[PDB]
Enzyme design. Structure first.
Site, short mmCIF file in Angstrom:
data_model
loop_
_atom_site.label_atom_id
_atom_site.label_comp_id
_atom_site.label_asym_id
_atom_site.label_seq_id
_atom_site.Cartn_x
_atom_site.Cartn_y
_atom_site.Cartn_z
N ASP D 84 -3.48 -0.33 -2.88
CA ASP D 84 -2.24 -0.28 -2.10
C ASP D 84 -1.15 0.53 -2.78
O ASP D 84 -0.88 0.38 -3.99
CB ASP D 84 -1.63 -1.66 -1.91
N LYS D 112 -3.95 2.79 0.41
CA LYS D 112 -3.58 2.11 1.65
C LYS D 112 -2.08 1.86 1.65
O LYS D 112 -1.52 1.45 0.63
CB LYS D 112 -4.35 0.78 1.78
N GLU D 163 -3.90 -6.21 10.97
CA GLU D 163 -3.52 -7.53 10.46
C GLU D 163 -2.73 -8.28 11.51
O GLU D 163 -1.69 -7.80 11.96
CB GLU D 163 -2.69 -7.40 9.19
#
Ligand SMILES: [Cl-]
Lengths: 251, 259, 263, 245, 260, 253, 260, 239
Positions: D84, D112, D163
């Site tokens: 991330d 990400k 998500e």
């Protein structure tokens, strides 16, 4: 084969198995030397000449040694990894220890530094704090009956202080013989004749990379061999059967 | 329960209550171990192997220990938090003190460092300055390149000498690593402070293992001194519970975990 | 001989003298290669693999390249010294310029960096400010994770057309040299024909203006099966010097790369 | 097996082989997850909660991600390593690139970062410069989600996390996109799934999170638990309806 | 010729070949001085005056000396390269060592620093650690504000000799004598084994040193007594430097008119 | 004499008084050059060769130039002090400005940087912010590796016009045929300073060490030859620039 | 006139010429004070009050002194330039030396630091390394929080006795100058008689080898008891400084009204 | 009296009360100037000459200005505190802002920087971000364009340096903001001098107000009074 340890080098001395040491500064040669069963790989300040192209080893920094140490260590060779503390990095025991810690964090398993009996305190300090030490006496690049006497005193003093290995550089063969007999730890010669527990050369010298006049202490193990691997094997083989160094490679 | 203090460990030794210690390097396990009534959590340089994937503990830095210490500390466990001074960070008493201060700022309540009787001056210096010290003798993994310890009669004698020296200098806890069980029994009996064994047998005031080992997070052959406490339990919590209870009832370590 | 310069490389193309390039990362090999009349010495990010023992070139830093550059330059070879800008150091034209300047201060005479048509502005920016540029198209090894490994590039008509577009773009922007890596021989042939600047192949066949290999590959340093495009010049030779001379000779006589080294 | 690559994920989507992704932050779990054939390991800013004991992920720094990335990478797993970019480290394309470079130098193979349509320029900038990108997103809300997903795919993202999305909205995003979708609390009609390692090992106090199954409970080893996760994702039994948004 | 070494300077003293030392601060002059067979090149804190245009040498830093040292070293002269530790950089033996190491990494082959017998520990420390040392006694310019010619009394001359013996015993392999009566410098030279290098110390030293710009005549107005302008009337700058080297070796310089 | 200023150089061009420029890198030579009435002293990146012993000028840093600048400036010469922005230090107008500021803080009164027409925006930016600029066209030694005609002459004139229009108040012409330099000088209003550009320039520059004979390049004369002192050599240079006898045809292309 | 040196101050005491010292912190006043033949200019930590507007001198840093020292030095005054080591910068001899070196690089020719006989080792260390030292006893303003304010020192029999012991110890260690601050006149008279080095008084009465005041005080920019405003009624700032110098040298300042 | 503010200076212009400005670089002079009712204290790059002994102002750094600004500010004068952004510190609007912020954190209430109409964007950028700006200009036609541009961009004060008197008068009449002259004649809204100059510690533009006053305070009071009664500058002090 198992990893080569400091106690293993002692056991080799006791058994009469000569120790083959070579300098090494990168992962590709670390792997190749290991295939050839080199016992000890030395990240030496010799890199100042052979890699950096400087006229002397004085410009080589601790960070320089740490970088090449990390390169060799990333190969994970079975050989014992020894790294030099360069000139200027071991002026006090505390400085010597900080320097050694940096190189051991980078993957060195033992450190080497140049000097005689004055180093005894420094050696004791490092060994007490679990840093293995290779001493280095004789011609020390960072720098007769009486000279031989002082060499022997130097070598005894660093052994007594706790060094577990010692390089003897540019010493008459008969003087090197006496030092080896008088010590319990293994001696490693360069230009010290064949009466040592083992031998070391600069990698690039024994692969014949130089131009013109070869140094007296060196043999070019590459000339006539079918591969670089075979050249390193031939060095290991010649150290171990006692044929290198020959009389022509003496001080 | 109340917070576990250094005097509490001493009282536990006096009362015959075995001390359950485990390594721990993050806040989730700090909470879980505390739920399971682990007495002492150790941010150890073992993290060099188990977390960082290094072949030895030598690369582990003071900053590394301080980071994992802060993580454990943020969970506010009742357990005593002990942190290692990594190799190279206690070469002089002043350097040892500076290192310990950094870890205590980050949440360590006691520091651990490896070595024998030569450390006496360093221990004295720290203790005088209000740093609680855990000594560590036997097999000291930072000395891997210099090198089970105390197998000789002289080896055993020196280990006893080392343990006595660091206690006399002011250590309030001591780890015994990879020692014959009979030798560790003698050390424990001769000291006043609590002893904590790993591969030292059951005749210690308490025990420590590396978290990941006792959770069976390793492939192939387990190390001789470890038990996988996870196998057959319903949860990771129950595995740590099982370790704590086995240390306390004296069933771990067994003869099979001992040299 | 006199110093090899960027305009000398162009003259060599026009004369049909193939350019012999090798990687080099230290002063001892800088001196040896120069004795063997290697034309260009490349301080390449391949050192991440061959010196540092990493699995890819991505960890190699600008400071790492500058260090090995200084080592090679200290030998004062007649060969042109080219140094890679390592991955992440040329994301904008200003960053690329600062990175090149650092390497040229350390002794590089030209910089090399990977990428296609999108690099045009960056190449222009550097050339305008007197930084000589070597482009690098085809299999660009810093793109290993975008590519999913070290795969041959330009195997389809659309991939071949884009490679030509990339080469043309970086030349128009002012690149004076270009490496073609892992490209079918007939594709490399067409790019060479279409460009005016010299092309230097690695795994691109023999229809390039010259050739490059990683030093350790052509000295046979590595065990087991080697990638197709490499040749071990050490085997059968009496010395490391002779191996390097053999490489130079084979590049210049057109015998390396052979069909066995080409896709 | 061979290494899992970005193109391999695309091939798996086309073959209908579901992609098993889990967070991972150290070398011991990197190795264990690899033994269990996890496809993708994510050094995620979830570490702010599960490792650092912070109440949110906001305190996690780039240096924190780089540290745990280096730890995972040193195990040399065959799984694809994704890391991330934390909040605050991708505010401009140049900043995003510098951040991604740091993490890829440390061993990440793809980065990400969270956000919608506005990220298109950022994604294009990174992809052009050979940084692989995993996007992360999640009636009008549904429309905007689909616009976000399309935008980041068009810009070059080769993977996308969905998500906390209704199951049928996630199903539509997956049908409409060409790249693989990775769900968490997005139902089973995604190309694959992701959980936080600690959640799926049951290392939480009290009530499981809604999207999560404890795969440890009842298994003989932690290895077996991760194996059960990978198998359940691949046979389509996880997530169940009880794990939906 | 072969490189000039520290042992070579000792051999020269024993053979009676006078040593020609000159300051030098850049690569063009390093090459020129070497062509003229200057024995020793000194990267001196005199650069504070002659290069930096300061009134004293006190502003000169260790980094300044390291820079000029690197410039001289890049020319790879055969001459021995000596560099000054500037005032403030050798106040403890550890500090003196750290400073010397920085200069030797940059290309110095020997370091020079000013002071008398109190420096003995410092000299020993450096020499034991393989740093060759040139001592410097007499008028030591970093001490300008302490002083406001040194050795003009019996007590002063006696202390100078004690200073010189102390630093030699500690391991200095060369020593500069600056602004000393000729007969006192002669006594120091006789009593020591190591070579002495004079500036304003008369001809009875093992050698001589001047500041480059002084002997090239770069400065207007009355010049200091112990300097000679070797450039005036020379066909080239090279010839001026050659003339200095020859004059030192044949005993023509310094004359009584350059001496106290 | 009064201090030499940028307007004084312009007045000299219009009066036909040739401008004598020399490189200088330290206080002793700053003073000596001033005694010889050198008009302009240049802290040039030539110091990379002559002082640092490097094969090229590319290693010279901004900090290097600043150091030598401060040395010259401490001598407080009447001559105008010009300092080079080294290669790599002027790649954007903001970078060029930051670099120039550092040199002017150290005592430079004008900065010099190499390049043609592309520099126009950079020159304007600096001049608007009160940094006087000397341009440098022809052979720009920082372009050594890039470099390894009717069109060439035409582009050089375009380059010179562009940097003048942008606000440069001085320009160095390096390694240009004499007749082409003559044309550039005639077409510009600002003073031109030649090195290997022949005598049809408003003034001349040489590297100090070259004209003192401390190494011979074609456009150089050793002014030390036949003179009784270093001062007399510098005097001889200034006189020969001013009476139009240097450079000679033997120094020109 | 020639430059004023540390040995010159010693000569002045022996000739009975009183030494006129003033604080100074910038180049314009450096030049003006020099025009008026001020003997010694002090870059003092008093700048913490008079320039910085702080309530005490404790906030003043070494960098602050080095800045104002460079400013004064750039004017190249003939006066001796003395600069204070601020509180906290001379806690060990090696620290004192590093601090002094920084100020001397910046243009100070002598350093001044506050304290009594405990400083002996520090003074010896500096002087041995060629740093000239001015001592400072009596009311030493960095000790304000130890003393509970700016209190006159030497009032009790024991206070005066310790002051004399301090003065002797620092002279014995090698101080070449000493400031006496806020001491009864009879006590300062005794210190001056017993020492051989020059004493410089401020609020110490007239029986010293010289005097110092803070510049701004004597210019009437503020009166404390031991200060005279030398500006009031003069035609220029120059004339005020000239009047101060004249009054110190003729023994008319300080008067009994300025003395304790 | 109350603190002198930026809007007070504007009110003074409208009332025809001349503004007395002086450089100041330390706390003792800040207090003395305040006692003498100096309206504006300027921490100017003139300190490069008068304090640092440099031949020019070019060596003066932002940190040098920030140091003397803090010294003046610690005295808490009622006068408006203005500080110079040195040459080299305002080359872009972002750089100018960062430099002004540093000085305002150190106690400056307004910043001054030199340049003509090219500064318009920079002025606007600072003023928008709540940094009060004093412009500084010093051919006649372009001078008016410069002054108008900086005013339109939001400068609330402007220094006119070395400007023929009749030209300064015209600029003052055309602007709405107050003008502050040095070598610009008496037809400005106010005047500035360097402190050390007007105290006689050394220029055509300057009067030594010290020679023959009984104190330094009296000298500064004489300056303030002569600016306000219009007797300074005299014709001898013109461009
Ligand atoms: Cl971390």
């Amino acid at each position: 084969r198992p990893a080569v340890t400091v106690p293993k080098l002692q056991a080799m001395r006791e058994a009469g198995e000569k120790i083959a040491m070579l300098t090494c500064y990168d992962a590709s040669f670390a792997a190749l030397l290991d295939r050839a069963n080199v016992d000890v790989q030395l990240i030496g300040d010799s890199l100042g000449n052979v890699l950096q192209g400087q006229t002397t080893t004085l410009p080589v920094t601790l960070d320089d040694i740490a970088y090449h140490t990390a390169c060799v260590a990333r190969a994970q060779p079975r050989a014992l990894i020894v790294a030099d503390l360069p000139f200027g990095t071991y002026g006090t025991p505390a400085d010597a220890f900080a320097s050694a810690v940096k190189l051991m964090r980078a993957g060195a398993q033992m450190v080497k530094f140049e000097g005689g009996e004055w180093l005894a305190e420094t050696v004791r300090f490092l060994v007490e704090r679990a840093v293995p030490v290779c001493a280095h006496v004789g011609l020390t690049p960072q720098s007769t009956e009486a000279g031989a006497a002082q060499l022997l005193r130097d070598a005894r003093a660093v052994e007594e202080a706790g060094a577990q290995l010692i390089v003897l550089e540019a010493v008459p063969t008969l003087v090197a013989a006496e030092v080896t007999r008088e010590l319990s730890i293994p001696t490693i010669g360069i230009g010290a004749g064949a009466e040592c527990s083992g031998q070391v050369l600069v990698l690039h010298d024994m692969l014949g990379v130089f131009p013109g006049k070869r140094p007296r202490f060196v043999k070019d193990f590459m000339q006539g061999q079918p591969s670089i691997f075979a050249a390193v094997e031939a060095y290991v083989r010649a150290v171990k059967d006692g044929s290198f160094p020959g009389p022509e490679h003496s001080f």
